[PDB]
Design a protein around this nucleic acid. Sequence first.
DNA 1: TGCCAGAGAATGTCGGGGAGCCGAGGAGAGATAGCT
Length: 49
Amino acid sequence: MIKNILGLALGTNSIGWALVKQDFENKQGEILGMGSRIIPMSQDILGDF
DNA sequence: TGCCAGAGAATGTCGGGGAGCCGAGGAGAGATAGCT
C-alpha cells in the first residue's frame, strides 16, 4: 500500500543512497531524500586496482 | 604514477638613507628724510 524503498549504488569509492516513500497503486510518491558519500582515493589507486 | 608541496619567475610596493632643493633669520649696502 505504502512502500519504503532504499536504493544504493556502490561505486569503487563512492556510495549513493536514496530513500523514497511511494504508493505504486495510485501513481503517488514523494522522495524522502538522497545523498552521496565519497571516500577520497586519488586517481592512482583507481587506475591501479 | 598522478598529484602535492614548494621552488621558480614577473610584478608592484615600501622602508630608508643619501641628493638636491629650498624657506628663513640675519648681515653688507645703500637711497633717503630728519636733522643741523
